[PDB]
């Protein structure tokens, strides 16, 4: 396997080199906001974001060493988590705003245009304020994303099929070493390294919570038959229910 021999500095280089672009939205500021229009913009945005995420996942160390069926499972359970943490990452330096795209900055007033979505907006905003409070670094953010990819579906799984489950934990421990190496260079003591490592992974519990809450919201608007979901998002959504 290639990923096992990667240096922590080379691990960061691989994750940073594989970062997906920041896609733009089709938002028109002249058009006022509505429920069907706003969810339509975010659906078109998240659908095009999925294509880059799927190709981003391939460039994650260790992900190619997994089964094609295992790659489908990991992306199916973590796709909204990865979208949300990237959204929270982009919105770090925009307090009270969610930067879905460089041309789409939404606050709490816009979130209320969709029924029940305002509660999820607050959680995303609190996560961004948490990222801003911790002064999260890009080298740490790309580590957290790849962790979500490998961890969010590793416990939802042939007796040898668990050997690849053991390989996923090898990469997970490898990314953990990378995070500790990053914090040591930033002048943090071993006690500060463990605390910051804990704080970062504790946020992944809220990211999972937001994904589960967001996954149910997408299922509700689907049965509403108000905003048509793309054919891929329907596949990703049906995998959760």
């Amino acid at each position: 396997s290639l990923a096992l021999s990667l240096t922590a500095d080379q691990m960061v280089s691989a994750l940073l080199d594989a970062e997906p672009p920041i896609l733009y939205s089709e938002y028109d500021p002249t058009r006022p906001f509505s429920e069907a229009s706003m969810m339509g913009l975010l659906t078109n945005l998240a659908d095009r974001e999925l294509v880059h995420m799927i190709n981003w996942a391939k460039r994650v160390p260790g992900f190619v060493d997994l089964t094609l069926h295992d790659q489908v499972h990991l992306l199916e359970c973590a796709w909204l988590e990865i979208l949300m943490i990237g959204l929270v990452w982009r919105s770090m330096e925009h307090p009270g705003k969610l930067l879905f795209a460089p041309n789409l900055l939404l606050d709490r007033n816009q979130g209320k245009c969709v029924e029940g979505m305002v509660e999820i907006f607050d959680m995303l905003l609190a996560t961004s304020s948490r990222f801003r409070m911790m002064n999260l670094q890009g080298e740490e953010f790309v580590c957290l994303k790849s962790i979500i990819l490998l961890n969010s579906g590793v416990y939802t799984f042939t007796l040898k099929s668990l050997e690849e489950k053991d390989h996923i934990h090898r990469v997970l421990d490898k990314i953990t070493d990378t995070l500790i190496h990053l914090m040591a260079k930033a002048g943090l003591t071993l006690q500060q390294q463990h605390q910051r490592l804990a704080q970062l992974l504790l946020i992944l519990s809220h990211i999972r919570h937001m994904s589960n809450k967001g996954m149910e919201h997408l299922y509700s608007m689907k049965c509403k038959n108000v905003v048509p979901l793309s054919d891929l998002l329907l596949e990703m959504l049906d995998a959760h229910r």
Partner: peptide, 11 residues
């Protein structure tokens, strides 16, 4: 599955 193709797409 669409996720199957895009993951399987080599070229």
């Amino acid at each position: 599955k669409i996720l199957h193709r895009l993951l399987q797409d080599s070229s």
